Design a protein around this motif. Structure first.
Motif: not given
Ligand code: NA
Length: 164
Positions: A32-44
């Motif tokens: 499952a998503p591991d919020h220890l690691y922040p999400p990496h946001i990218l352009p589409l």
């Protein structure tokens, strides 16, 4: 990057009308998503090489716990999952300019990635509920560590195109 034989690595690749959101997953038995690691946001329209590299980096950080270790219990604790999930939603709304979770999630598609012994299983999904995604049928993109980051990025975008 170091991937071990017999070890499972997992990650997620979500996309809405404002961003791609790449996330490390962790767990034991199920992931499952591991919020220890922040999400990496990218352009589409991120280039395939950046998208492939980012997902490989996310997979490299995927943690496999020993069942019932302090890390496992913490990760699967109901209330901790809830608190970390709500923090993730609030932070993503802030990072993407949304004032409601309804808008954040409305058009959000989700792809899962599982690496095991060099094999990459990249799975599309159906956005079945506002904040949940379920598997669809026989639409996986299957690649491997033979593939360059750019080829992996292409297969990720292909799997996203198969989401519904
Ligand atoms: Na995810």
């Amino acid at each position: 990057m170091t991937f071990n034989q017999e070890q499972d690595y997992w990650a997620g690749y979500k996309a809405n009308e404002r961003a791609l959101i790449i996330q490390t997953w962790s767990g034991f038995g199920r992931y499952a998503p591991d919020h220890l690691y922040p999400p990496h946001i990218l352009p589409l329209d991120t280039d395939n090489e950046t998208l492939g590299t980012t997902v490989l980096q996310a997979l490299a950080n995927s943690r496999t716990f020993v069942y019932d270790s302090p890390e496992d219990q913490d990760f699967f604790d109901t209330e901790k999952i809830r608190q970390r999930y709500e923090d993730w939603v609030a932070k993503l709304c802030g990072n993407l300019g949304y004032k409601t979770r309804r808008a954040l999630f409305k058009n959000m598609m989700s792809v899962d990635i599982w690496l095991h012994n060099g094999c990459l299983k990249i799975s599309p999904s159906r956005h079945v509920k506002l904040e949940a995604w379920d598997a669809i049928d026989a639409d996986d993109v299957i690649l491997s560590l033979d593939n360059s980051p750019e080829e992996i990025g292409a297969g990720l975008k292909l799997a996203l195109s198969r989401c519904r």
